[PDB]
Amino acid sequence: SFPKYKPSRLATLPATLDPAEYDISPETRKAQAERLAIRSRLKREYLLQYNDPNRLGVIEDPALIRWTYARSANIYPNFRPTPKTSLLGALFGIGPLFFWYYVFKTDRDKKEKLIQEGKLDQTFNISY
Amino acid sequence: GAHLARRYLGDASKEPDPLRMPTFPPDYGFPERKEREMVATQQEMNDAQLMLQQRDYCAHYLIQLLKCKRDSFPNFLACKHEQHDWDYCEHLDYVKRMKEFERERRLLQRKKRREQREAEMARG
Amino acid sequence: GGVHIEPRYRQFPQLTRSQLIQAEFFSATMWFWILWRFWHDSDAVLGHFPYPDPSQWTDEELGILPDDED
Amino acid sequence: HTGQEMIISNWHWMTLQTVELSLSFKMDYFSVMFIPVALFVTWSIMEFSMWYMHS
Amino acid sequence: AFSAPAAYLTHQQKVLRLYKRALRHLESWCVHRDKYRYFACLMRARFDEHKNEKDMVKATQLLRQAEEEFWYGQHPQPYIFPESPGGTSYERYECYKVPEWCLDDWHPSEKAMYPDYFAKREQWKRLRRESWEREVKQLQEETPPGGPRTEALPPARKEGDLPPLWWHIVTRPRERPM
Amino acid sequence: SGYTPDEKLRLQQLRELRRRWLKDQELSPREPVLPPRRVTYRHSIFAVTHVLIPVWIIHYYLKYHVTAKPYTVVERKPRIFPGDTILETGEVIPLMKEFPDQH
Amino acid sequence: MLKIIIPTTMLLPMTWMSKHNMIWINATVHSLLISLISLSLLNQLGENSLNFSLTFFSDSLSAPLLVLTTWLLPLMLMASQSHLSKETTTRKKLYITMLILLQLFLIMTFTATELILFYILFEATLVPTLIIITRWGNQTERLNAGLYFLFYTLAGSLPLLVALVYIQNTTGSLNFLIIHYWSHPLSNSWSNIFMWLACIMAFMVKMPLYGLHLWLPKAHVEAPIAGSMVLAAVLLKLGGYGMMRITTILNPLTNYMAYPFLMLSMWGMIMTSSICLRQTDLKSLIAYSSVSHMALVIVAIMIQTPWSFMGATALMIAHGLTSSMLFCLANTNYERVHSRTMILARGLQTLLPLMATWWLVASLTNLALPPSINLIGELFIITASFSWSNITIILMGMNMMITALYSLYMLITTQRGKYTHHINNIKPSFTRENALMALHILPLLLLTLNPKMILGPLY
Amino acid sequence: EHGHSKMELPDYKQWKIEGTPLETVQEKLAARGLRDPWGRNEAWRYSGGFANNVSFVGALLKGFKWGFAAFVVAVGAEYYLESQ
Amino acid sequence: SDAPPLTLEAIKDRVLYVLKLYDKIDPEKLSVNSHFMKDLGLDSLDQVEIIMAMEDEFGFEIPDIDAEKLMCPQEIVDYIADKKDVYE
Ligand SMILES: CCCCCCCCCCCCCCCCC[C@@H](O)O[C@H](CO[C@H](O)CCCCCCCCCCCCCCC)COP(=O)(O)OCC[N+](C)(C)C
Ligand SMILES: CCCCCCCC/C=C\CCCCCCCC(=O)O[C@H](COC(=O)CCCCCCC/C=C/CCCCCCCC)COP(=O)(O)OCCN
Ligand SMILES: *OP(=O)(O)OCC(C)(C)[C@@H](O)C(=O)NCCC(=O)NCCSC(=O)CCCCCCCCCCC
């Protein structure tokens, strides 16, 4: 026995410590085989397009286009106003503004009161 | 260290506070109280423009050493006697500071002993 | 701009006498310098001015009275 | 030899009202002592790199 | 790198991979050669004491406790060969690798230098042009229906044929181009 | 374990092609066909063109343009010790107070 | 001022009567000559202004903007020469006509001495830009983009017109000289608050202010290269110039009406900068960086101090040049790759080294490396903000760090690493592209030698 | 000018485990019924010019003898010149 | 750098040199084409150790998927040559 490793979000579990790789079933082997099959099909398509002498252009990747489209333009049509989104939007978009307003307003009120009472010592403060 | 152990592990009031030292009148021990003598005047000490921290009671030896250093330039080990003289004067200054520390400590000892004897006489 | 030295394959590499003598000379120079400086300036290590004993000073020079006057 | 110290404000860059920005060099003890050391080390490093980065 | 991967690793491959990893990390712990030799012989003796075991279940129970023990004592700073994926010179020369097709964009005053090289290059280009038309059909008929099952490629089987999809493997830039 | 026969054969064919390609990367003795067309000594010229000319330009610029304006080159005041004499005036700074010297 | 206006007008018949194969040459040569002529406006006084006539006047705030406007036209022509090769002669002449009309409208807008005249030309600049975006744009989103660019603008500027005529019925004049000399304080009142909002919002929406900036990424990513150049370099600065001009009649209301916008800017510059950290489009990243810089300019104008105004002027000029250069670099990649996605074309330093040097210099300038005039403007604004409140440094400091990050990010993703294997159509850089980058970058480093030219009228 | 001199390998029969710490490793292994099959592959690390070692203190005192002799000569000359 | 341009003969000589110092195999029996399991009667662990000795000898690492199918000295030499771009 040895002290156990505890995985986290930013330090994931090693593959050699996965119990899932020791629970081997025929269905698991079939899933692995068909995953390799689809990877092989994609690799064959890419390599046929890549080794072609005739082609003189960037090869188009549908996966990259889908990624960029999902990140940019598919956002709003799938947006739904929910309590979670409404609350997070209100917080993240309004709270910082009022926090900084309070901080700066308090600071400037303090400075203005000090100036009016004359106890600030602004000697040599010529450029503003 | 031993004074740190004495003050921090033993009785704090038994030992001087370096920041607030001295706490007793200079004439408390003996009434002679000869004054310290300074050799370098304000003007020449300003003309030599030593530093505000080198402007101490050993400044004349520093001025002489600087004169040697400037005068015999290429031979940078020519004037070592005056370096020794300045170092000796600084040594004597440090010894005087140590004597001040010791005197304050012994006066504190004696004052606390007076307080204990007076308290014993009052309780008896 | 050096000379040709072939690899050796599991044997000690070929050495020039020049680098050996230069390295020995510079090590000897460092040790001679240390010995010379210690011989001439020993106070830089062991000190020159003795440290006085604070408890060995008599009460006369410290302005201490025999616990009865003031 | 002496303790020579200098300020050289040679080129006037601009003036924002009461603030004058000019190209000024401080040739004090720190500058005149650090420049030779940096140049010596740089000369050694360049000679070393002539051999180290030959390929 | 060169060999196509399979769908899964068998038990034997996993055991051998553990053996190699453990020996490498033991070498990283034992800097000196004689100490490493002694402890590596000890590790070999520890490794083959269950070499002859028959049942799969406990043989898989072993190599799990072995992985846990390895991960506990894995020397967080193991030795890496400088060109290996973690080494100090892994992708050092990646910036000096230029594709061959860039030579097609050289100025004629540049190609005027090195005429023999560019004549040989034209020979290579025409060879590629014929071989590609042969290779496409060869791969088309050699593939099972439904698509490839493994990303392994066949050799050439005729006389004047070339291995399908050979151009970008044969014309690699170099290991140290500049 | 080991290679399948097809893998072995493909490897031999690929490595023969690669060795041919690598051999074709060498240069002939005449390959860099260079077209020619035009239109202590070294240390001396280096010291003349890289030290003397810049120092001349900089000294001229400092002596006749920079110092033409006030406070452009400000010097730290030289140190004065007792017993020194001044070139400009010629008076002698008095000595110190003859401190008691011993050790 | 007509010595610049009349040749710009004569550009149109010269374009239309030109030969079919000589439009670009003639347009470029005569635009460069007009820029050389407009260089003479830089001789300004410490006194009032260069009041040429009752209609036009020039200032040390207007002169650098005019010089930038006249200099941008030849660069736009060079950038547009490439992708307009297969276009009919009449449509190429129409494109050049749109560019010339935009330059004419901008020239007049900067020098107009009347607020109403300024409003009319400030709106007239919209039509050529809208036509350029929606006609010669590439993707299908351009139409939507154009709509945004229009209505946002109009939604801000229709109230301003109302306010303007109202002011002229109260003071009796909209001439800027009279308005400055006869200024009166604004009392704290609801009517005065709404007049302030009407006078401010039209210029806020075109900076753009954070939260009102949604039109800018659409317009800049959907426009052709010349449209992006003119939008980022000149059209954004119209709001800054307008706010600098109009704040003279808004005091002392600005002392407390500026709080909502200042916050919206000081926080906003953070958000947009962070947005640049996660972006998959080059043009979108450059547009968001423009939003951050303009937020800093908004803060500078709202602070209303001499150092603030100097920094705002310098930053406006510097950002114009830098953003135009960055858009040109992105377009020179796009015309080879046709994707506009950052991670497609990679390791381009190996294939195009001099273009990589141009990329490095542009990234360094956007990063505000001293002594560039970008850093001069940024530092003057930061010092003024620190005097306004010592806490601001925090936000300002954060922005600085973030900016460097994303700038170098854009430099590392596209130029470093390994080249993409299947992209084999990356041809050597043309002399036209290299000359375009050189003509962008040399004026910046030249201007760092005489910063007083771009420090505005408060120098 | 590069190193093409046709370097020839030494004889593999030369490397022997005797007289090395690998011999002690082999003895310890045989105390448990094991053997080291790769022992002769490392023998060259203890065979030729690599057979002799230097201590840390010996490494620090690399040039102490010549420096000490020079120091003795110099101090003697200093004594014989000052005393004049 | 200053690294001599190793050749196929050098690679073969060094591979055979390392193999002859493996006391598990008889130096008379082995050749360039002598198989590991069948010709010399070795195990899989022995093959892993041989690959590790090759890696230590030549200063670079062979990935496990490639290393597991190198069953003759000749294929070891071929792998090293293909990796290091050896002409002759
Ligand atoms: C969306 C993306 C951003 C777009 C741009 C946003 C910027 C616009 C923000 C508008 C600036 C503030 C407007 C008014 C500021 C005046 C100060 C006043 O509101 O505060 C208190 C006023 O108290 C309350 O605010 C009274 C008004 C309450 C009703 C107003 C609605 C509050 C939130 C509405 C926000 C909606 C904005 C978007 C509209 C579509 C002061 O108390 P009081 O001393 O008595 O009044 C002083 C003014 N006097 C002298 C004229 C009398
Ligand atoms: C990007 C979208 C932005 C849309 C524009 C936002 C700015 C809106 C500014 C207010 C709109 C109307 C401005 C009025 C024009 C100025 C003229 C003026 O100030 O005169 C005032 C009149 O002021 C008004 O009447 C204004 C009333 C408001 C009516 C219109 C409401 C529009 C929406 C108001 C809330 C939104 C404002 C801020 C929006 C923030 C951005 C979304 C005094 O009238 P008198 O009666 O003659 O004098 C009083 C003494 N007898
Ligand atoms: O003939 P080959 O093809 O070479 O087959 C080799 C072998 C038969 C041994 C093997 O491939 C196999 O198939 N074995 C069958 C049973 C089996 O192997 N069961 C698992 C045994 S696990 C084991 O060996 C114990 C591991 C002990 C070492 C732990 C490592 C910890 C190191 C920590 C870092 C220094």
mmCIF file of C-alpha atoms and ligand atoms in Angstrom, chain G residues 188-191 193 196-197 201 204 209-212 256-257 260-261 264, ligand 1:
data_model
loop_
_atom_site.group_PDB
_atom_site.id
_atom_site.type_symbol
_atom_site.label_atom_id
_atom_site.label_comp_id
_atom_site.label_asym_id
_atom_site.label_seq_id
_atom_site.Cartn_x
_atom_site.Cartn_y
_atom_site.Cartn_z
ATOM 1 C CA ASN G 188 -27.513 71.245 -12.362
ATOM 2 C CA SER G 189 -30.983 70.674 -13.823
ATOM 3 C CA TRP G 190 -32.890 67.828 -15.450
ATOM 4 C CA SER G 191 -33.160 69.808 -18.687
ATOM 5 C CA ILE G 193 -28.787 66.769 -17.816
ATOM 6 C CA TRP G 196 -25.651 67.011 -21.796
ATOM 7 C CA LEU G 197 -26.721 63.484 -22.739
ATOM 8 C CA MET G 201 -24.118 60.268 -26.737
ATOM 9 C CA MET G 204 -19.813 58.211 -27.356
ATOM 10 C CA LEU G 209 -18.062 53.406 -25.726
ATOM 11 C CA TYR G 210 -18.147 50.032 -23.997
ATOM 12 C CA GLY G 211 -21.667 48.635 -24.141
ATOM 13 C CA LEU G 212 -22.390 50.632 -27.311
ATOM 14 C CA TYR G 256 -20.469 64.532 -12.154
ATOM 15 C CA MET G 257 -22.101 63.512 -15.446
ATOM 16 C CA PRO G 260 -21.139 56.483 -15.514
ATOM 17 C CA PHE G 261 -19.005 56.663 -18.663
ATOM 18 C CA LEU G 264 -17.910 52.039 -18.282
HETATM 19 C C1 LIG J 1 -26.421 50.268 -22.391
HETATM 20 C C2 LIG J 1 -24.900 50.484 -22.662
HETATM 21 C C3 LIG J 1 -24.368 51.820 -22.045
HETATM 22 C C4 LIG J 1 -25.004 53.081 -22.719
HETATM 23 C C5 LIG J 1 -24.483 54.422 -22.101
HETATM 24 C C6 LIG J 1 -24.859 54.585 -20.582
HETATM 25 C C7 LIG J 1 -24.599 56.054 -20.062
HETATM 26 C C8 LIG J 1 -25.923 56.821 -19.726
HETATM 27 C C9 LIG J 1 -26.155 56.944 -18.174
HETATM 28 C C10 LIG J 1 -26.947 58.238 -17.786
HETATM 29 C C11 LIG J 1 -26.145 59.139 -16.776
HETATM 30 C C12 LIG J 1 -26.954 59.441 -15.471
HETATM 31 C C13 LIG J 1 -28.297 60.190 -15.766
HETATM 32 C C14 LIG J 1 -28.737 61.133 -14.598
HETATM 33 C C15 LIG J 1 -27.593 61.430 -13.560
HETATM 34 C C16 LIG J 1 -27.991 62.595 -12.574
HETATM 35 C C17 LIG J 1 -27.836 62.201 -11.051
HETATM 36 C C18 LIG J 1 -29.124 61.567 -10.456
HETATM 37 O O1 LIG J 1 -29.582 60.566 -11.286
HETATM 38 O O2 LIG J 1 -28.843 61.014 -9.177
HETATM 39 C C19 LIG J 1 -29.745 61.337 -8.141
HETATM 40 C C20 LIG J 1 -31.179 61.534 -8.677
HETATM 41 O O3 LIG J 1 -32.059 60.674 -7.952
HETATM 42 C C21 LIG J 1 -32.697 59.711 -8.762
HETATM 43 O O4 LIG J 1 -31.790 59.232 -9.697
HETATM 44 C C22 LIG J 1 -33.896 60.360 -9.487
HETATM 45 C C23 LIG J 1 -34.161 59.723 -10.887
HETATM 46 C C24 LIG J 1 -34.609 58.231 -10.796
HETATM 47 C C25 LIG J 1 -35.228 57.721 -12.141
HETATM 48 C C26 LIG J 1 -34.144 57.524 -13.248
HETATM 49 C C27 LIG J 1 -33.993 56.012 -13.663
HETATM 50 C C28 LIG J 1 -32.871 55.271 -12.840
HETATM 51 C C29 LIG J 1 -32.213 54.086 -13.651
HETATM 52 C C30 LIG J 1 -32.553 54.149 -15.195
HETATM 53 C C31 LIG J 1 -31.384 53.598 -16.107
HETATM 54 C C32 LIG J 1 -31.864 53.332 -17.596
HETATM 55 C C33 LIG J 1 -30.769 53.710 -18.658
HETATM 56 C C34 LIG J 1 -31.099 53.138 -20.085
HETATM 57 C C35 LIG J 1 -32.396 53.760 -20.694
HETATM 58 C C36 LIG J 1 -32.941 52.937 -21.890
HETATM 59 C C37 LIG J 1 -29.293 62.628 -7.446
HETATM 60 O O5 LIG J 1 -30.320 63.006 -6.524
HETATM 61 P P1 LIG J 1 -31.041 64.508 -6.695
HETATM 62 O O6 LIG J 1 -30.298 65.529 -5.862
HETATM 63 O O7 LIG J 1 -32.482 64.428 -6.230
HETATM 64 O O8 LIG J 1 -31.009 64.964 -8.301
HETATM 65 C C38 LIG J 1 -29.951 65.814 -8.748
HETATM 66 C C39 LIG J 1 -30.297 66.313 -10.189
HETATM 67 N N1 LIG J 1 -31.085 67.586 -10.114
HETATM 68 C C40 LIG J 1 -30.196 68.600 -9.518
HETATM 69 C C41 LIG J 1 -31.440 67.936 -11.517
HETATM 70 C C42 LIG J 1 -32.350 67.625 -9.340
#
